[PDB]
Amino acid sequence: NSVQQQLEALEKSSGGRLGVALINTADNSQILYRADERFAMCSTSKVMAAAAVLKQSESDKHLLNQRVEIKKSDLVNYNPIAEKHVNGTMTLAELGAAALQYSDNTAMNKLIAHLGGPDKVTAFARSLGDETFRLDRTAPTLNTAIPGDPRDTTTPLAMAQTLKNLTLGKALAETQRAQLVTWLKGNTTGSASIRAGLPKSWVVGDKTGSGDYGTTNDIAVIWPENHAPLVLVTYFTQPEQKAENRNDILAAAAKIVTHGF
Template identity: 40%
Template sequence: MLTRRGIVMGGAGLCLAGCSEKVNQAIGLGQRLMEIQKRHGGRVGVSVRTSTAVVQGDTAADGSLNINSSQRFALCSTFKWVLAAAILKAVDENKLTVAQEIRYGKADLLDHSPVTEKHVAKGRMTVGDLCSAAVAVSDNAAANLLLPLIGGPAGLTAFVRGLGDTVTRLDRNEPELNSNIEGDERDTTTPDAMSSLLRTVFTGAVLQPQSLSLLRDWMVATVTGPDMIPAGVPKGWTVGHKTGRGANGAVNDVAVIWPSGDKPPLFLSIYTTGGTLDDTGRNQIVSDITRLVIDTLAFAESLDSKSASS
């Protein structure tokens, strides 16, 4: 259940102690978030991080906002950006190249495999093109063709463990991983874990610069979910994101958001499950949360600027 106590802001975002304006804004934020979750009718999880956030469970010491952020949600296709990162890590270690070709046939095609289906007559695609298809278009067959290159679902889990993520796990391939059964921990993550993973990959030394640039390009080129996180972001900002949908109302979007100017990126993860809304309504929930998060952080920044100049 979402409560005001479960909403935590700090440092670069909001603090719940000190400035009365920030306290009032936090109370208003809590009310609006509770209204959004009530409108959704199911369970909503949100985690946003800045590049300097220090996070412990459901509390944070700098630049975070959490709602049900330590609860598990089905990954669905949001795992595909992590898969691409793992592939690029193998490329950096000279275990793979983005130019090497993977052969496949009609038997490998799945529902929602538009790119691999287009090239099935040729019978092969490069690793780089498969990554692009898996991330930007959410091509399911592309993801399944890439997974064996890193040791399958267990290999992806091992990859995130190596980055300090003890929560995220992948157990199955497409499409089984989308079952989203309540209480089933297979193929799940938490909003906290995913936002922290985004931050680790995009601000750390996980990938070589060329590989990180490729990953960013693939995520920015995403064509799925334009009415989700991207719809809640101000004009002129850049969004690299990965959507996911599954059974039982799972609708997710995770993103790296680069504000205009020289400001550091935000790392936002929104996971939802259950509820009775249609697809348009579910997507609207995600964009509304995004807009609320960004408005809240912008409000806090304006207060900090006034405080610094006074």
């Protein structure tokens, strides 16, 4: 079976819908599966919000250290870092780190509020040439992941292209690019997702997402030991609202598409 056959078979066995885009930066080749179809991003959208703040910081040397007050009323469904800082402050940099490395939903909301709302995140994506990304809601409602709902969606290929631009390319100034990469590499939430399908010693930066409809996502940049980087988006969603999330499917997809590399 070819790689395409392998992916189709994975989806068939999955009980849902799998979206994969891998970009091999060695030769600009791609491994694409439903890559122009829309999926709910869930918390993978946090990369775009953090990057939008990094872009602003290029032209404001005080931005990343700007204090943001954290209140009990800011707490939502999942906020392991922000809850430690109630009655105190976190900087915008600390909010970026918490959003990306712990998937702190309060931190995401502070980034969105700072930027001026979800539509400002969409505008930032558009500024990078991403015609597909849209952010419509704050956390946690951006994770409803209802089949066919266009809110808070993108396609695997659009997200792979933009993640490449953000981390390895044309989107950010060098210090800010490096900061985004540092954040992604230090993610704590991705052990069982793309990372689990790769050689243990490969360096990886990623951002996960999980939502309703068993929606289970991960977006990654991967640095092999002897090869150019790979950029990989694995999105997965299921037909029933209360389906279990399935990080194992993402690991399995990663293993399939990184074979040989």
